[model samples]
Target: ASAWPEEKNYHQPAILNSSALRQIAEGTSISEMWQNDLQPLLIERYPGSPGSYAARQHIMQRIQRLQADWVLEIDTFLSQTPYGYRSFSNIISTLNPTAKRHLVLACHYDSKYFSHWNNRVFVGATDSAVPCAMMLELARALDKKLLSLKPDLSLQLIFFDGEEAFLHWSPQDSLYGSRHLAAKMASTPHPPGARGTSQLHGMDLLVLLDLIGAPNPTFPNFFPNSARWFERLQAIEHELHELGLLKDHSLEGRYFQNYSYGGVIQADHIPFLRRGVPVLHLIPSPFPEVWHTMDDNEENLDESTIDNLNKILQVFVLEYLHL
Candidate 1:
């Protein structure tokens, strides 16, 4: 099963002459970029605060710089609660408007505050900063290829706000951005002549990344309906191993399965799933020991783990786009 052609390369596609995989392999230093640059900027990204707003502005600037050729759309929603009226911004960049199907890769950028620690600033690095940074890196790497494949495929990168509860975890306080966006999409009708697509309904799959950047993290299938997609990801990992791009050849099944823990999770995908979109949640189970704590900072992130996950996602996107 490990046999593959010596010259077989999954990165080089006929549509584009250059190799996306090769670009990723050329040492983007994703970990350094995360730790030294993005994480510090996003450490105290508390909602409605100057830090949080700065993070939003930074993401927009980064995407524009990395994907200058692509167009970006912002969906800003207001979430009113007993605390106050808060704004939840969702940043989206799609490959094409007319594409029949869409794929969404999303992460929340808000950090939580710990009341017990005297309202200590919680960075939530592994909780989501790394995931957000990962998405940015993906945009930087895949921009050209995705632009070249426009009209054939649509890829959306969404950066969500207000994912964490302001005070405590509750249905009313969590997932503010996603819940508002999902409901708006559900109520709105597609524009005339837009025969095949209607807002969020066009999304074929939603992959939510959270609690990543931990050492040797394992993801489990949260939804049975999306199990096949998880298997495909596993196949890609195996192929990478066969091609010598990956060093570990363990049959321990790291890509999918109940390697960590099973069952559905409550996340940004919940609103989309409620609206019938299949979700592939990439969060690890039993979470990291430092989850939601001050220890969940950039110092604890594993660079090797981040690199591997980035490669896997890049390969998966290539295969999905048939590039």
Candidate 2:
């Protein structure tokens, strides 16, 4: 596979082949379209496994090493491990001082232990590896662009640790890294008159990617204020669809019905959402059957799924940042 292009090369080519934007605009299946045409372009050349803590660590080390020259700072969480080996979080950013009106792309690098869903080893490929790697790849794409911008806004790609709970979900044990960051942001902040700003206010939006690499991904805009976020997402999907880069499996409005009403997610975005950041959790509705199961592997994921997400986020970064 060719090396991922840098920011300057990030612009979408005239993929519609001069088709009238309106022409493709009439009656389209964004998901199916991507699955057929754009899907092949999005396939993952490398295996992605979220369940493998070792692999996640290896990837992080590689990120740190690859980004060494550009990394202004790498903050470690220094989380204590049960085995006393020592664990910590990684904050990799290219922005200096800080970028104001920031946007954060976050995801957990950890995996679940049980495969109750598939009665297998529970690799958590679609569960999170897809989304987490997408964030990493996005960083690679945005590194130069983020630095060149003059706005005080910052773009931080946070690979959080300890996001999963012990089998059953528990607030106390889950999302420790994000919760820590949220608390850190909440207590230490600047306030203007009556309105208070969270540490995350440096960022106006948070896009969390999870379970995005599965075949026929179904992302239903299902967060609180989902209608607004999904509208934003719908627009992006449409743009990607027009660009010949995304697919919107009909699975929309199907699996996330419960979350559509409550907007509950078990990923890293919750903490920031509570801090009042407008967060968009880009997750496939009705998580794949391979979720958290041994069968969750690179084979289960489509390159198009990751590519679709990559293009979606790319479009979002370009438009939202008003670049």
Candidate 3:
């Protein structure tokens, strides 16, 4: 495909062989992940609400269960939102905190606040509950493998809170957590011996997942710089299906589309993108049918799609980390 202008070129990471990918995908049970992580995360966790606190604790508790050496920090800060100032916390966990640079995987944990629920809860399953659960499941799936590899670029996941707008989506209302985080990371220099100029600069790529876990989702190439990386995701799906490792035939060659879709969807990545961070926004362009509605609950989640995503991301991260 033709290269898009501006910014640096996307470096194609070493692709793991089919056997290696199959080996990494072993013992993946999206059912167990659903009961343990996804179910608990399906709550009306609007910012600063008690539900949000529970969501934060669940992420922390699960992080403790991973038998991996990780530096986990609940990066909490107060930011003024459309409403009165509210508190927000972005869960930051790194496989090797001391690594020179990092490959970031991120998603929002907070569900959108509503004036009134009309007696129905807005759990935001595809809106991001599934994405956050997928991140944790990916960590658990790769826990032991990651522990054995020590590389210059570490793996990190940032579960940003308050990604939803209190009122309406806009510069002022949307992305309360990431806007604060990007600025903070830009100003905070790394340790004296660290290689990065600032924490923000240390991020090699921001792979943001949102509105996933729905059936027959289509992910178009949103950015040219990350187009090659996105292609790798599509390629892996084909490889897995050919190897008989994937059961969801409906999603093959269709989930990650080939052509680059020229547009941008606003979410947590916006703040960091403005700071010159390259982002691979993994969200369906048309969005799932249940987006931002009461129907966006666990019943709407597709296990086949989620499981396929789980395997694809597992291999993707392992390949990127050269494990």
Candidate 4:
């Protein structure tokens, strides 16, 4: 029993038919994506590091290869770090810029800076490497496929830089990239006919991914406003499993197992969330066991789990955009 949906922030788009799902699922190779996208991001990418620069360049280059009508905008600034002021950049790429509203999929593009075990090998795999790689693959897979859908809402991928803390997670150290970008977007304005007043106002949803890419990870229903959207994701996962489209049958219900309301996690979403943006935070509540550690490397990232999430996310984007 549901009420009549409103025109804005309300969509009843059905899931993609089986053949369309098949095309997306079968054509995806999680292993290849890991090798190309995920592997490059495995290095120590604390802001201002060579690895950070490499990650930024790699992301832009991959998008360049896409050669879609993606409008690439790089926001660079110097922000205060625990050690000192460091440079950070947010790599933002959008498809269908002419659309009034946008569905933004975001993830931090930097790894933690650990001084104790500074082997220059801190692979924050699940922390953000996995999430970062997932975005790239999503864009690559759907860049062309989406042309036929003619979605009114644009698809925006934000690879936020300097999300990790230099020493410890605190208000001052962490979220430099997100805070800077959020402040900037809030000040700017889209055209008059856009979704909302400011650039931040125009964002229909900010779906932030973090501490993902582990096996059997369940997400908490974080925001009340986006609870319906979260439930839709749960339903989407279950439907994908029921159709025999997912490899991990046991974890089909993982997205919303014993779900509760009024729980939230701290991440890049906070800045935008405070500015009145409806966010569907996708980080696992209990978090992946490999979260924020050296063991959080490629070996710990389950390819089957990655593949399963990839299909789920692809279907989510395609369906939500009215494909």
Compare the candidates by lDDT and give the number of the best one: 3
- Candidate 1, clashing residue pairs? none
In model 3, what is the error at residue 84, expressed in angstroms? 0.9
The best candidate in terms of TM-score: 3
Score residue 170 of candidate 1 by CA lDDT.
86
**Please, what are the lDDT tens digits per residue for candidate 1 over residues 203-225?**
66788998897776778776766
What lDDT is obtained when candidate 3 is compared to the true structure? 0.83
Residue lDDT tens for model 3, 1-323: 21221112444477898678778667577888999989999988998889999999999899888888877898788877767787888888887776656889999999998755678878899989999999989888888887785435778899999898888787788888899889998887753354446777678789999999888888888887677788889888888877888865654346887767776678899999989888999998789999888999888888988898899888888888777
Better of 2 and 3 by lDDT: 3
* Deviating ranges (above 4 Å) for candidate 1: 1-24, 35-37, 115-120, 195-197, 247-255, 258-262
TM-score of 3: 0.93
RMSD after Cα superposition, model 4 = 3.5
Predictions in order: lDDT = 0.70, 0.54, 0.83, 0.80
Give the range where candidate 2 is weakest over 10 consecutive residues by summed lDDT.
1-10
- Candidates 1 and 3 compared: the better one by lDDT is 3
Per-residue error at 170 for model 1, in Å? 0.9
| TM-score computed on alpha carbons, candidate 4 | 0.92
TM match of model 1 to true structure: 0.85
Residue 31, model 1: Cα distance from true site in angstroms: 4.8
Error of 3 at 287 (Å): 0.5
lDDT digits (tens) for residues 1-323 of candidate 4: 22211234665556787788788788677877888888888887878888889999999888888846777999999986767777888999888765656889999988888754655478799989899999999888887875553425667899999887787777898899999999998987663444446777568889998888887778888777888888878877887787788885565446665476575566899999999899988888688887777888888887787788888888888878776
Residue 59 error, candidate 1, Å: 0.8
Q: Which digits, one per residue and each the tens of the lDDT, describe model 2 over residues 2-27? A: 12112212322223322433232332
